[PDB]
Design a binder for this molecule. Sequence first.
Ligand SMILES: *[C@@H]1O[C@H](CO)[C@@H](O[C@@H]2O[C@H](CO)[C@@H](O[C@@H]3O[C@H](CO)[C@@H](O[C@H]4O[C@H](CO)[C@@H](O[C@H]5O[C@H](CO)[C@@H](O[C@@H]6O[C@H](CO)[C@@H](O)[C@H](O)[C@@H]6O)[C@H](O)[C@@H]5O)[C@H](O)[C@@H]4O)[C@H](O)[C@@H]3O)[C@H](O)[C@H]2NC(C)=O)[C@H](O)[C@H]1NC(C)=O
Ligand SMILES: *[C@@H]1O[C@H](CO)[C@@H](O[C@@H]2O[C@H](CO)[C@@H](O[C@@H]3O[C@H](CO)[C@@H](O)[C@H](O)[C@@H]3O)[C@H](O)[C@H]2NC(C)=O)[C@H](O)[C@H]1NC(C)=O
Ligand SMILES: COc1ccc2c(c1)c(CC(=O)O)c(C)n2C(=O)c1ccc(Cl)cc1
Ligand SMILES: *[C@@H]1O[C@H](CO)[C@@H](O)[C@H](O)[C@H]1NC(C)=O
Ligand SMILES: [Fe+3]
Ligand SMILES: [Zn+2]
Ligand SMILES: [Zn+2]
Length: 341
Amino acid sequence: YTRVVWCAVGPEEQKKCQQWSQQSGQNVTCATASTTDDCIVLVLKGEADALNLDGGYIYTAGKCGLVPVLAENRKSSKHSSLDCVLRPTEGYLAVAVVKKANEGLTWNSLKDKKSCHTAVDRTAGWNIPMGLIVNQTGSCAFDEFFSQSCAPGADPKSRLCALCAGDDQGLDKCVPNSKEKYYGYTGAFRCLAEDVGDVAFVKNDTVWENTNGESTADWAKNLKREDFRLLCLDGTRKPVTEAQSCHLAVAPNHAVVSRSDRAAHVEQVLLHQQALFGKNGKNCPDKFCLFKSETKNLLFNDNTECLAKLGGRPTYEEYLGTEYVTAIANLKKCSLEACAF
Ligand SMILES: *[C@@H]1O[C@H](CO)[C@@H](O[C@@H]2O[C@H](CO)[C@@H](O[C@@H]3O[C@H](CO)[C@@H](O[C@H]4O[C@H](CO)[C@@H](O[C@H]5O[C@H](CO)[C@@H](O[C@@H]6O[C@H](CO)[C@@H](O)[C@H](O)[C@@H]6O)[C@H](O)[C@@H]5O)[C@H](O)[C@@H]4O)[C@H](O)[C@@H]3O)[C@H](O)[C@H]2NC(C)=O)[C@H](O)[C@H]1NC(C)=O
Ligand SMILES: *[C@@H]1O[C@H](CO)[C@@H](O[C@@H]2O[C@H](CO)[C@@H](O[C@@H]3O[C@H](CO)[C@@H](O)[C@H](O)[C@@H]3O)[C@H](O)[C@H]2NC(C)=O)[C@H](O)[C@H]1NC(C)=O
Ligand SMILES: COc1ccc2c(c1)c(CC(=O)O)c(C)n2C(=O)c1ccc(Cl)cc1
Ligand SMILES: *[C@@H]1O[C@H](CO)[C@@H](O)[C@H](O)[C@H]1NC(C)=O
Ligand SMILES: [Fe+3]
Ligand SMILES: [Zn+2]
Ligand SMILES: [Zn+2]
């Protein structure tokens, strides 16, 4: 009676779900879809129960009447008086990153350059950057601003995927799941790292997690923090040590959403699943760890300490915040009252 069905996006998140499933006593089983939007639809239909989402998609899902249930929490200095689950989230910092070697590249000369985005409609990788740029340009022509990009989820032979690489066998070019090589936080940063783009729109954490031997991967093991700069909105450039005074915005933590008729039931099971497989669980890191996959962020971000209860029972609008939700509306009028599905 108590069983939850997770929705996995793409073949890699599937395999990871399958393990979680088997290690759970079929307390959690799996559904798989090729895109986040398709997983949202599975959940509305009632064939899946839940998944973890970037704030940009929480805005989609919430118009269709889905609700935040538990949020991700990463390591925190302040607020250490308290327990992670009852501990307040903070929100990550969205940044624009460049090679140090590229002098002359400022927030003011981004026109006609090459760009690396997490995916279309995501907070740090899309809504923040393109919102600012529509504003400063007064045009909805965000498809003509950069010469070429990789923006997973756009038309495959527009210039917005022009830089995307697809899977081993060259298939799936710019699909929005991890088969695409430059998908998500890690892929967008790899995109700038390998000098395919001139800038990448990721979050502060991503730079740290993938420089200075912090990530054991082939493309990144020789990357070094001092080789990068952040672009600030006042036209200057700073070390990645200054993210606190040189970001584009702060962003709501990714959160697990479900259909509201299912929210209590999902919350109940997951809090128990993190007790077995979480950051200090009975069975992690012995048998299985929910918050770990090789710097991939599969199902969850790897820097997740825990899933946190929500303060005060949010609506998705309260959780996303008033500031970020007007940002999104203003952008969507470019490309008020109806589900996308
Ligand atoms: C932008 O994002 C970054 C990435 O998250 C973030 O920095 C983190 O800051 C948090 C809290 O402010 C900090 O918290 C700690 O938890 C750590 C676990 O993550 C504990 O540290 C130990 O474990 C980690 C992981 O294995 C080791 O990580 C390394 O990275 C750095 C540099 O590569 C080095 O660590 C340090 O060495 C200095 C020496 O002076 C020392 O002062 C520090 O305390 C630390 O030890 C190290 O070379 C490693 O390669 C590390 O070795 C430790 O053994 C720790 O107990 C503490 O509670 C977290 O570590 C930071 N993340 C990382 C990976 O650097 C920024 O805060 C974000 N900035 C903004 C503005 O939001
Ligand atoms: C790009 O520009 C648009 C258009 O201005 C930005 O939206 C505007 O920004 C501010 C900040 O949220 C909004 O004003 C605020 O509204 C509430 C009540 O209206 C008020 O109490 C707040 O203190 C604040 O004044 C304003 O409503 C909004 N304007 C419109 C027409 O919606 C948008 O945020 C920008 N996009 C990005 C990513 O910056
Ligand atoms: C009405 O009470 C709150 C409480 C928290 C808030 C906001 C409003 C708004 C803004 C708004 O929508 O106007 C934001 C952005 N909040 C946060 O980001 C935040 C982050 C971490 C924690 Cl632990 C708590 C809150
Ligand atoms: C599965 O769920 C049942 C109900 O709580 C519980 O008895 C059991 O401990 C759970 N097993 C695991 C491994 O989650
Ligand atoms: Fe995000
Ligand atoms: Zn700020
Ligand atoms: Zn409320």
